[PDB]
Amino acid sequence: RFSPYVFNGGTILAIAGEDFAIVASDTRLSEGFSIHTRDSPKCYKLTDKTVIGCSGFHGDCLTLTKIIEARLKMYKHSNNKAMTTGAIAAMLSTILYSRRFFPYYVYNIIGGLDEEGKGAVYSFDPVGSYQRDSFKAGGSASAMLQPLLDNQVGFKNMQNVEHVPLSLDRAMRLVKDVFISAAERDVYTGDALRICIVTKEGIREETVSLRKD
């Protein structure tokens, strides 16, 4: 039986602040019991304001990002303006759903700046079904990074703690420290970290080292 889906692992992450949106993912591209490459960053710069993550079946990550960017230049041609994050979110919902019967098996997490300069992160699933959150993990290590991001970012189950706004630095140390917390335990996470920060100034890229073993 030919199987058309393989879990190439690698986790992404996205956070929304008052004025930014980080997106991060490990670049281990695993399969079975090996490591294809210790470098295949799973964030793809879509526009000047929108950084899209993709984890899961690596082939559909490539095809899906290529289709998205093609749709962005189609939009820009017929409308004379780049898609915002809102439009990219909805359009990626109809792309991911128009194959409802043989899915793109790719957990997207689109983070970026809406037209109000405020953070926005649209976590998806393989068959469409999006939403806007303030933070999100996806992929292999979503279950080990999600609760800690609830804790230090959502401040849930706390008492007598000031729900201070999410500052860019503390979001950074959250990203790196949580990916280390995953690299210790998740088998599919590690070998690098590709943290892309989004602001009005453009997209600045930052990488981090992790456990290789």
Binding site: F2, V6, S34, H36, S40, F57, H58, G59, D60
Partner: protein, 216 residues
Amino acid sequence: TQNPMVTGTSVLGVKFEGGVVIAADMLGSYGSLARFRNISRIMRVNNSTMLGASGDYADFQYLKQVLGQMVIDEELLGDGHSYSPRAIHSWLTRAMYSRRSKMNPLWNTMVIGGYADGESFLGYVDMLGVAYEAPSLATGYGAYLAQPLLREVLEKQPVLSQTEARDLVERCMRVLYYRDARSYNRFQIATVTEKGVEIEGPLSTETNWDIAHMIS
């Protein structure tokens, strides 16, 4: 092509300063049998590209005729625009992917290496659409045996002189001969550089069996 009839074994790929070199033994199997023992699994696409393939061999010849047909159609124009290795890599990624999308998958695991504009490209494309670059590739069980040797040495030396790469490929293929059941002591080494694609072979692998007298 749901089932493989005549497969090959692992292909090896490794970059080096100013060119890429790959090897793939000239064996073509049919089950456990080593039916075809003098088939070449490395193609020259043009002066700057050369391709490899494990897995099903018939589909490899389909990609030879189609792909060489493309580069010949493009050489016909004589407009100075030729597919860099990145273009050929992306194309095979799309053909393989689409064929997957129809559930008629080309059962290849190709490894495209090339050298255009002094930048050694080295791609990978398996049947399901997975693709990526890397300093060292090995399809099939080569990703199990020769792959740790190549990432070990490249870890020790990410930039390699050409001959050091060639010995590294020879020694990896020595391991594949000793341990890969579908292997055979007859392989080609392809070198793509400034000058062009040169396909040496059939080569062979010296083998040591001193351990065979150690058991007692």
